[PDB]
From Swiss-Prot:
GO molecular function, one term: cyanamide hydratase activity
Outcome following mutation: N63L: Reduced activity
Domain (Alpha-carbonic anhydrase): residue spans on this chain: 1-255
Family affiliation: Belongs to the alpha-carbonic anhydrase family.
Name of the protein in question: Carbonic anhydrase 2
Function: Catalyzes the reversible hydration of carbon dioxide. Can also hydrate cyanamide to urea. Stimulates the chloride-bicarbonate exchange activity of SLC26A6. Essential for bone resorption and osteoclast differentiation. Involved in the regulation of fluid secretion into the anterior chamber of the eye. Contributes to intracellular pH regulation in the duodenal upper villous epithelium during proton-coupled peptide absorption.
UniProt record, GO biological process: angiotensin-activated signaling pathway; carbon dioxide transport; morphogenesis of an epithelium; neuron cellular homeostasis; positive regulation of cellular pH reduction; positive regulation of dipeptide transmembrane transport; positive regulation of synaptic transmission, GABAergic; regulation of chloride transport
Binding site residues for Zn(2+): H90, H92, H115
Keywords noted in UniProt: Acetylation, Cell membrane, Cytoplasm, Disease variant, Lyase, Membrane, Metal-binding, Osteopetrosis, Phosphoprotein, Zinc
Species assigned in the record: Homo sapiens
Residues involved in substrate binding: T194, T195
PANTHER family: CARBONIC ANHYDRASE, CARBONIC ANHYDRASE 2
Comment field (misc): Target of drugs used in treatments against glaucoma disorder and breast cancer.
Alphabetized InterPro entries for the sequence: CA_dom, CA_dom_sf, Carbonic_anhydrase_a-class, Carbonic_anhydrase_a-class_CS
Length: 256
């Protein structure tokens, strides 16, 4: 599976029939159809004890991985029951600034999208959590191109050391608080992983406020490779799944 003509999102259903399921992600967020939900509790993003370990090119994106062996960086509140532990973050991005996000907002595509992936600690590990309908919570954050994001630059600067699939580097002492916008206003709906195996285990929390990154920052994302070392070079661009049918879902807003 991949993002090309012969193996991209329109082919995934053959190996992963849940691609045509009832709660697939991403979706278009129709802001006028979403409803404010007073039942939502305040969202709690507690990342001050986060322990990053490594950065990995997995051939689909690059993942910044965390030590999730203790409750050190967690998401709670909002639509969530219980505590969800941060395991990794990654991005999806475009070949041009006009596309790259997975979710869309009134059909608007952003240049990129950040996914902070968390698992529900009552299931003990990530692998058990993805067997559960409420196993995961993904915090999604849009990126637009304008001013640089200072807290992204450490990520940008290490990308040259993980150019190709299967390469990793030490990535300790990175603070993901530097990737968050001012506001935690959000939309939320039930969905799925956006790459194979496309499992329907995710409570999505998508922030309304994008972060701004510079053109030079996103240009460095686009210098990564989908291929392995010594293989013909295929730039890692347009690694996003388009919007999927909303089906029997409602999107709730935390803000009126
Ligand atoms: Hg699941
Ligand atoms: Zn993702």
């Amino acid at each position: 599976w991949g993002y090309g003509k012969h193996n991209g999102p329109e082919h995934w259903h053959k190996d992963f029939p849940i691609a045509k399921g009832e709660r697939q992600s991403p979706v278009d967020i129709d802001t006028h159809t979403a409803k404010y939900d007073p039942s939502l509790k305040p969202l709690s993003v507690s990342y001050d004890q986060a322990t990053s370990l490594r950065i990995l090119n997995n051939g689909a994106a690059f993942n910044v991985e965390f030590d999730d062996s203790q409750d050190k960086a967690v998401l709670k509140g909002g639509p969530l029951d219980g505590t969800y532990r941060l395991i990794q973050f990654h991005f999806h991005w475009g070949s041009l600034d006009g596309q790259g996000s997975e979710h869309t907002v009134d059909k608007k595509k952003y240049a990129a999208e950040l996914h902070l992936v968390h698992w529900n600690t009552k299931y003990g590990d990530f692998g058990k959590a993805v067997q559960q309908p409420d196993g995961l919570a993904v915090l999604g954050i849009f990126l637009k191109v304008g001013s640089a994001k200072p807290g992204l630059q450490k990520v940008v600067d290490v990308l040259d050391s993980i150019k190709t699939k299967g390469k990793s580097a030490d990535f300790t002492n990175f603070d993901p608080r530097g990737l968050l916008p001012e506001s935690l206003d959000y939309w939320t709906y039930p969905g799925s992983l956006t790459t194979p195996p496309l499992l329907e285990c995710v409570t999505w929390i998508v922030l309304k406020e994008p972060i701004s990154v510079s053109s030079e920052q996103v240009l460095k994302f686009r210098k990564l490779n989908f291929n392995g070392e010594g293989e013909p070079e295929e730039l890692m661009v347009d690694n996003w799944r388009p919007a999927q049918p909303l089906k029997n879902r409602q999107i709730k807003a935390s803000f009126k």
